[PDB]
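Incident log, entry 3
Record: Signal transducer and activator of transcription 5B (536 residues)
Problem: checksum mismatch between cached and fresh output.
Input:
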Amino acid sequence: SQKHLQINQTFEELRLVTQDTENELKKLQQTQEYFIIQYQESLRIQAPLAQLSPQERLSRETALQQKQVSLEAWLQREAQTLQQYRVELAEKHQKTLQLLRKQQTIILDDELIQWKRRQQLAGNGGPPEGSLDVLQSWCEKLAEIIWQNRQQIRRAEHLCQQLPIPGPVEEMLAEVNATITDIISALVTSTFIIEKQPPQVLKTQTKFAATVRLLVGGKLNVHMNPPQVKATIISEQQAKSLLKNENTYSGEILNNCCVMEYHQATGTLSAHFRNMSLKRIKRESVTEEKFTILFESQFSVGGNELVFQVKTLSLPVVVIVHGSQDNNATATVLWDNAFAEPGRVPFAVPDKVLWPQLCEALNMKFKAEVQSNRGLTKENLVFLAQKLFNNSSSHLEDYSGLSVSWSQFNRENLPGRNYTFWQWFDGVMEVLKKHLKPHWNDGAILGFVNKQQAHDLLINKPDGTFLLRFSDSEIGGITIAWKFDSQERMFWHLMPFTTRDFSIRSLADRLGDLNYLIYVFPDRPKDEVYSKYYTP
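Fresh output:
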């Protein structure tokens, strides 16, 4: 709300200029209305009497001729100054439209794109996009202003019809009116946006919902006949070709389609699809290929033949065969939302991406999935960097460059056999989501440490001190590294704990069973950490 004031200041300026231009047009109408009555006086005086003496007739005729030439000189002057006023009106309307064009481009091409990008990022666990009531109010002011100016210009056109003065004013009005229709088309087509987009990575037969909105709908007389909006699922090639306006239905049948509703209190025109269900799908990989939900409608503005065909595209959606593949499919979505270009041709993502750029997305989605504000720290980030690029470095700035190809992210296996770097990271995400979210928030799980790295870090600690790291041995497991003096002369080796283990006994109970483990990493004792989570 710092440089939002810039927008509202420009809006007050626009309001003032349209108001004073309307006042100018009122004065011009009064001027013309008086001019035509004086011109009718000239018509009555035009061309002229009954029987009189030749002495009085000369006087009468010369007085009438005087009145006639005077009235002609008065009319030519009045017409001239009237035309001056008219061209001034056209000039002021032009100026207002130019600045309104700048403002509309500011809102539609920047702020709306910013909000849509907020939405895009929220799909990866980022901050929520927020409410469009600010953008809705802005678009209401835009529509109000431009429609009022259209009314003023058409009124000037009608006024020019009744008393035509040659000049260059008709071309000015024609040029300005075309600009008006162009602006209206841009506004109406650009403010048909998906408020809550439908949740990507969806299976067939499952009910999902999305909500689309018309930001300008409150006014502009679209609400008078709330149009029907139809949703249909189309492939990526279909979306690409449609944006180029081809013709082709690329993803079989969709269950629903609905009509818009207007909340007078909220003052919003929106379409709520609460019960859509995907029942069939046409169909490189069974899971990488992305689709999109297309919403389209058509509506009229007031009493005009002006009909707008509008369409909008959801951000890319992936269709899952069965839950087994779902864990992988989100990876695809993760890249798109993370790395979609601003003016991208539909669903085109870079294959390169630098490491810190991927780090920001991984960290964001991690804090989202584990439902905590702990998140990824620098040491964790170096751990995953050493995991991805087999490279001997323990400083983050050494990995400040480096490009993570999509393949090495999710297609090429690591030096192990884990389903690429993404599967291991999604595995730790899932194990902490379903089982160990509280222990992650509490700080008991260091996790992002290595066996030897956990070792030398843990040697000096007193006997009985443990720490839990995420196993590179198994995908979804965590292992324990412990401190005892005899240790190596003893046997004792434990298997990593996975979801299967955690389902029957749970982590706190497993640690309770092991009496020889008594301190969490630094000085924290076991009971202090796990007392509330032990099973009474």
